[PDB]
Structure formats: C-alpha cells, structure tokens
C-alpha cells in the first residue's frame, strides 16, 4: 500500500569480503503516530 511509501525506509548495502560479497537489506519502520508532516414453535 501507500503506508510503505509514507513510513518504511529500506537500504541495500553490498558488503565485500574475502570469500564473496553479501547483501545487507535494512528495512526500518518508524512510528506512524510521530508523523509530523401466528405463533410458531421450532425444535432441535
């Protein structure tokens, strides 16, 4: 939805090491409350 465009933030860093490279995906969701801007008888 649109709450993803308003509130969550994602960052992807490729960390280069001695074997290979890895993928670091940090996804932080901030607080949305701090967004400043006849009678019948039946029987059973």
């Amino acid at each position: 939805g649109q709450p993803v465009n308003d509130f969550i933030d994602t960052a992807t860093r490729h960390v280069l090491m001695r074997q290979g490279v890895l993928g670091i995906k940090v996804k932080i969701m901030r607080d949305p409350a701090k967004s400043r801007t006849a009678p019948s008888v039946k029987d059973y």
């Binding site: 006849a38 009678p39 019948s40 008888v41 039946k42 029987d43 059973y44």
Partner: protein
C-alpha cells in the same frame, strides 16, 4: 355457586417494591420476599382478618435492589438474585450467606433451583443464562438471547427425571426458549410474542408454558409437544405469572390488578383489585409479583406500595 377470593389483610415491612415471592412446602407458615429495599424478609404467618403476626428475618447483603428469590422444599435456604450482578444463598434461620454467586456482567433478574436442590440457574440483563452448582461454581454459560433475559425457570419433571433436564427462559427479544442442560444446548424456540416478555412459568406437571409481558397477551404453549397452544388477552402489561398447585388456574399480575383465569372450563375466574387510599387511577399500585401457597388455597401478591397483600379461596352460594 362460585369460588371466591377474599382479601385477608396485609403484610408490610418493606421500603421498596415487593418484586418477588416464594412459598415453602416443608413449612406452609413461611414466606420469603425479595424487595427493592435491597433486603429479603422471611415471614412466619399467623393468619388473622386484618394483621399477620410475626416478621421473622431480614437479609441485608445485596448492594442494589433484590429482584428475584426462591425457597427450598423444606424451607431452610434462600436464593436471591440482585442488581449488584451477583446471587446469594442464605439460611432462612440465621441469615447466613452460604455462598456468593459471582459471574454475571449485569443485573441478575431471576433465579430458580431444581427439584433436588443441586442445580442453580440464573438469568440476567447481560443476555446470559448461567448454570451453577450449589457451591458457587458456574459450570454452564447459556447464551442465545439477543435482548434482556427477564426470567429463567426450571420445568417440573413428570417422569421422575428420566435424563431430561429442561429450563425455560423469557427474553425481551420477544421469544421464549427451552434449554436442555444435559449437553447445554437450545432445545426449543417459542416465537409468537409481539413485545417484551416480562415473565414465564411452567405448569406443575411440566408440559405447559405461560408467557406474558407488555402486550398483555398471556400465551400458552405445550412444551412436551413443543407446539404453540393459544393466547389469552390480559389487556394491560402482565409482570408475573404463576400456575396453581392443585387447580387449573392462571393468575397474572396486570398493571390494573390481578387477573385469575381458568383453563378448564375456559373463563376468567376473578379480577382482584384492592382499595387504595388517596391515589389517582393512573397512580394506583399494581402487582409486580405473586406466589401460590402449598395447597392452592392462598395467593400472596407483592405490590409496588411495598405491601404484600394476600387472598384466600372460599366457596360462595
């Protein structure tokens, strides 16, 4: 040749409306009365033409007004349902609360204990028909009413409890309901009422149901057959119903008076209206409760002027 009800006097000691009455079988001299003075009074009656002797005990223990009460067949215990969302089990002797039934979320409007004094049902304004032991333990929660539950009664067995344990309730959702408490499920849906059902009672044998309310329609059903029988017009609002232990009479508490009907032969036996002193006619006290005695000869009536008026059947010329 008529069978005449005569005003035998008055029983007064309450501060609020006499909302319930219950008589005894072990001792036919005992009357338990639940009132809107948040107390129940137990009387030992000495029947004279104007006054009645001894007022035995008071049972102060309910925070808000006491709505319904019942005695046991010997007359040793009391069972009071109050607006404090609780029930209580008293000793008619000392006034000792043997147990407090705490479970409901609103005002408890009715209470009745079974034949062998071991299963205690309770109906309230939180549309909940709870079933308790005698020790204070809720073992059943029978929901089903979508409005208030004005009255819950246990139906008198005729086959000596042949595994059939039935209770009948009167909702303000304009329906009567019959529950089987052997598996805890709905067993019958009595539809037919057009307004709020104020009361309901099962006949002595255990096959007739009488439900009336605001419409003034005393509707009779057959519970053993689970089919609608008929309807008797009681005109004004009927607050309490009761079947005679011996006779085939049905006395209803109408906003005008106390209408005693017969079912065989079909006719209105009486319409009991006591003389009031200094009141307008839209200011006259009505019957809010009534209890039949152990032999069908005495009719006790709990009124709204805090006074329990009593009638006795004779035989006229």
């Amino acid at each position: 040749s008529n069978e005449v009800l005569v005003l035998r006097g008055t029983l007064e000691g309450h501060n609020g409306w006499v909302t319930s009455l219950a008589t005894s079988a072990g001792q036919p001299n005992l009357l338990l009365s639940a009132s809107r003075d948040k107390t129940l009074i137990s009387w030992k009656l000495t029947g004279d033409d104007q006054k009645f002797g001894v007022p035995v005990r008071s049972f102060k223990g309910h925070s808000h007004i006491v709505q319904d009460c019942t005695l046991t067949a010997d007359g040793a215990y009391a069972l009071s349902a109050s607006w404090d969302k609780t029930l209580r089990l008293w000793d008619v002797a000392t006034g000792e609360t043997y147990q407090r039934f705490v479970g409901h979320k609103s005002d408890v409007m009715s209470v009745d204990i079974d034949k062998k004094a071991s299963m205690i049902i309770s109906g309230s304004r939180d549309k909940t028909i709870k079933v308790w032991t005698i020790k204070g333990q809720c073992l059943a929660t029978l929901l089903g009413h979508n409005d208030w539950v004005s009255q819950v009664r246990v139906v008198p067995n005729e086959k000596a409890d042949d595994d059939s344990v039935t209770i009948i309730s009167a909702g303000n959702d304009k329906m009567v309901k019959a529950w089987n408490l052997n598996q805890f499920q709905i067993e019958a849906d009595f539809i037919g009422h057009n307004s709020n059902i104020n009361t309901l009672t099962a006949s002595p044998d255990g096959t007739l149901i009488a439900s009336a309310g605001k419409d003034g329609e005393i509707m009779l059903w057959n519970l053993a057959a689970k089919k609608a029988m008929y309807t008797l017009s009681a005109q004004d609002e009927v607050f309490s119903l009761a079947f005679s232990p011996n006779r085939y009479w049905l006395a209803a508490a109408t906003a005008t008076g106390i209408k005693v009907f017969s079912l065989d032969p079909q006719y209105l036996v009486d319409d009991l209206r006591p003389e009031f002193a200094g009141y307008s006619k839209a200011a006259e006290p009505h019957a809010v409760s009534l209890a039949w005695s152990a032999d069908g000869q005495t009719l006790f009536a709990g009124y709204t002027d805090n006074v329990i008026r009593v009638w006795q059947v004779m035989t006229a010329n």
